[PDB]
Design a protein around this ligand. Structure first.
Ligand SMILES: NC(=O)c1ccc[n+]([C@@H]2O[C@H](COP(=O)([O-])OP(=O)(O)OC[C@H]3O[C@@H](n4cnc5c(N)ncnc54)[C@@H](O)[C@@H]3O)[C@H](O)[C@H]2O)c1
Ligand SMILES: NC(=O)c1ccc[n+]([C@@H]2O[C@H](COP(=O)([O-])OP(=O)(O)OC[C@H]3O[C@@H](n4cnc5c(N)ncnc54)[C@H](O)[C@@H]3O)[C@@H](O)[C@H]2O)c1
Ligand SMILES: [Mg+2]
Ligand SMILES: [Mg+2]
Lengths: 507, 507
């Protein structure tokens, strides 16, 4: 149990620069038009540093470097690219605390999360894709005695990637590890709310990559992001974030006829069947933790289990176990490892959540816990903290239909399996679901029946590599965190070779 | 040598109905608002039959039937779906001549093409996907001792497919075989120029599929096609056709957040290196036939080798071999197996090609052969026939950059390999390429260097199943004619199962 000192104060593991540049062609550079913005910490509302408010000119300067690097990088051997990714993972792990404190400071989440989930998972994502590129094969098949089809994976070349602020470094790893393993150059546009972590990381790893292979351009969505998403000099666009912006991203890709992948959030149901109350006491506790895991990362998780569906025959008994855990949630300084729920990422997100709490009250949702701002001591008072909130309601309510992205769960009941499936699928989203039952047949039936990319069965919030992650329905298109992604970042070249010297007989 | 009688005349293998319906819910039905259009044969200009000028209401009635069938079809066993596709293939082969004559009549191409390529390839495509769905596996991987990731392929459900007129039945097979193999229901919108073949096919196979699994709605692109492309009741959209419509299709999918694949034509280069004239005489003949293969299907082929790139050191010698074959092309009745080039598909396409021959004259392209309409005898005088045309020019001309989609090849030269690659890649397209060289190293270097989905090496115009077909750059996104496409027609369900009963330690 320990408390990390705030950056720049005595004992801190890091002191940040007062100003950061874009990372282009192997070096930090200022924005072309010299404009900056100020990034603040959500821990205490206080400013951190200045970052470029880049424009189209910077995106094009980054695309120049990426395009000059792409040919030699795409032709770097699989072994060598793999080995570089293994060194990136090493550097992440050797700097685990530094990166975890940076991430907490910039984003607000509890440092026990960055120490145990974000940074280690980010390092492992690089080892995983370093390994999968070693294993990747195209194909060779004999169509007939003198005709052979070869399929060779090729880099797309230069790709654009736009990431959000809820897992700044993990999202970066999710995007960069496969794109780089596949031999592409990247222009990455981080979320303007969280520009710091990727800058610190680039200071740690930048020398491992040839100049121009990894380019990071800071700035606002409707400026730097839009120049990248509409650019005619990228071969592919990747995006994680809001549904309206994602749809716009897909429209930009449609105009240029380039492939696209997007992950757009969800309204994931956590489904609890009655037989869990006949299982072991540890399992009942695990199921209750699975509901309260909705408050992990302050609910700022695309697969946050924001609807709990509890079989009505066990609702009183099971909710007793749930509420014991909600009530024990320790609040405080996000840099205290004891703290279990940190700060929201921005004032805007803070305001969004408070609006939804009012909408919930107005439409008749009943508060079982929380419901208000969390007022914390000292310097934390200027930060953005909300109480873990549990609302009783029905699936027709707005707060059961729209993604809040705060520490808010709506709980409702169902009578039988058919109704649980109907409520679970009564959403436009389809990113994740949780499923709690010890009957193998129900586990399988519900697992197949839920229209979601991931169904966590008797667990929640596990995001290992080697498990494909992505949307059904409006939650998006494509998959991440699995070697199948390499195909989103590569093109298939079919050499169709004839070894027959004779004409076909047609002309 | 055989001459098929014109449909409806003595000796014909088929006589057509005067009016055809939409195929919805297992039966032929009239359009909701009773509007029809007349389909004419491009062989002789004479009308064939009436087909629905369907509206949004018909699209929604087909989606109703598709959605009522989707669940049971999706849960039908792999063996059973495979066996149905195998029966479809047998029915196609059992009616080979009937179907080949129908396709010539509706589309205009020479019956030797439908007899030897279209119909047999259509039959084999069903066998191929019947076989690939037997072999398909998802995955199971142990993440740790108590955590297993399962990935199960699931049908998308109801999908929309829009196909063009240059290979009416083969295009139908290319889209339908994988979609049905994957357990999806289909709403298919055939090209209004060629509605006939798919109707005859449905008469032969409709009883093999459950009602509502396969629905075919005829009509105009701007009406029936647009209703399908903008539908919020499809999980996926597939399209082959023009660049402007395909981009619009991608925008429609963007709005609805659904996966999409499109193939949008090309300007494919056929590259001839000097060493081929050091090869066997048969091989030189084969290469010369490979250039003249541009006139296969009247040049109405997305990968028509419409730019010929000849190394200048062999240009005189090799063009002598080419022109020998150009001069041998027999014209006449497309129902004569001796006819080597049939009719263009429509007046609009016929006129489009004639415009491009005119543009070619004005910009200085030199006629090496052809260049005018082909005036044919008797009833053919009312059909659409253009001479096989060979223009000498340079790659910057409009006729070297824009897709003509008629029997027209632009020939130009290059000095060395670097120049051949630059000219070959000097296009917005990237669907195919032809590559003729017997030096193993040059074949590999150019094969990798060309930005196109398929590089035919020492052959051209082979479209076997089990060789992936699809675009680089503006030629589209996705792949066809290969088992990897099944992923375009399925969702990945990740069951992430924990067998440990203990809480994680976070809440
Ligand atoms: N393999 C290919 O990509 C391919 C195929 C055929 C033709 N072409 C080229 O495409 C043109 C042929 O003319 P075309 O008008 O028939 O092409 P097209 O793409 O418009 O027609 C093919 C299909 O598009 C549909 N369609 C048209 N408008 C639509 C809309 N607004 N919404 C939904 N669907 C719509 C139907 O017309 C048809 O089934 C060019 O002349 C030719 O060079 C390319
Ligand atoms: N994991 C996720 O799916 C995820 C992540 C963040 C936010 N969200 C949800 O989105 C809501 C709004 O938060 P937000 O405004 O930060 O999301 P956002 O979609 O606006 O921003 C995410 C990223 O897109 C960029 N962007 C914004 N507009 C752009 C444009 N026109 N062109 C190109 N790029 C653009 C942003 O700069 C950022 O990098 C959240 O409350 C939450 O519901 C979801
Ligand atoms: Mg925004
Ligand atoms: Mg059109």
């Amino acid at each position: 149990s320990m408390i990390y000192a705030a950056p720049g104060t005595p004992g801190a593991v890091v002191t940040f620069k007062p100003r950061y540049g874009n990372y282009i062609g192997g070096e930090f550079v200022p924005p072309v038009k010299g404009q900056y913005f100020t990034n603040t910490s959500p821990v205490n509302g206080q400013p951190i540093a200045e970052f470029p408010r880049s424009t189209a000119e910077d995106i094009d300067k980054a695309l120049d470097a990426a395009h000059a690097a792409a040919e030699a990088w795409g032709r770097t051997s699989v072994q060598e690219r793999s080995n570089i990714l293994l060194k990136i993972a090493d550097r992440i792990e050797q700097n685990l605390e530094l990166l975890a404190v940076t991430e907490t400071w910039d984003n607000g989440k509890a440092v026990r999360e960055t120490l145990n989930a974000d940074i280690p998972l980010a390092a492992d994502h690089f080892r995983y894709f370093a390994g999968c590129i070693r294993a990747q094969e195209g194909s060779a098949a004999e169509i007939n005695d003198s005709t052979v089809a070869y399929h060779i994976h090729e880099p797309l070349g230069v790709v654009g990637q736009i990431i959000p602020w809820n897992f700044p470094l993990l999202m970066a790893a999710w995007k960069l590890a496969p794109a780089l393993a596949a031999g592409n150059c990247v222009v990455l546009k981080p979320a303007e709310q969280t520009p710091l972590g990727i800058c610190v990381l680039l200071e740690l790893i930048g020398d491992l990559l040839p100049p121009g292979v990894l380019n990071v351009v800071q700035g606002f969505g409707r400026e730097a992001g839009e120049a990248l998403a509409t650019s005619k000099r990228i071969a592919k666009i990747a995006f994680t974030g809001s549904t309206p912006v994602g749809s716009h991203i897909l429209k930009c890709a449609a105009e240029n006829i380039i492939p696209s992948t997007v992950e757009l959030g969800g309204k994931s149901p956590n489904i609890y069947f009655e037989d869990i109350m006949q299982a072991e006491p540890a399992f009942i506790e695990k199921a209750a933790e699975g509901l309260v895991l909705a408050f992990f990362n302050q609910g700022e998780v695309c697969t946050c289990p924001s609807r709990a569906l509890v079989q009505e025959s066990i609702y009183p008994a099971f909710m007793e176990e749930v509420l014991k855990k909600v009530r024990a949630i320790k609040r405080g300084d996000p840099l205290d490892t004891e703290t279990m729920v940190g700060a929201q990422a921005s004032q805007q997100q803070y305001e969004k959540i408070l609006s939804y709490l009012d909408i919930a009250q107005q439409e008749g949702a009943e508060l079982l816990a929380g419901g208000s701002v969390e007022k914390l001591e000292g310097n934390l008072a200027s930060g953005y903290y909300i109480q873990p909130t549990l609302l009783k309601g029905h699936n027709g309510m707005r707060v059961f239909q729209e993604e809040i992205f705060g520490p808010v769960v709506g709980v409702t009941t169902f009578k039988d399996e058919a109704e649980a499936l109907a409520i679970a699928n009564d959403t436009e989203y389809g990113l994740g679901a949780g499923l709690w039952t010890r009957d193998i047949n129900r586990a399988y039936r519900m697992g197949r029946g839920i229209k979601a990319g991931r169904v966590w069965t008797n667990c929640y919030h596990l995001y290992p590599a080697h498990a494909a992650f992505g949307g059904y329905k409006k939650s998006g298109v494509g998959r991440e965190t699995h070697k199948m992604m390499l195909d989103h970042y590569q093109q298939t070249k079919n050499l169709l070779v004839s070894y027959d010297i004779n004409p076909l007989g047609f002309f």
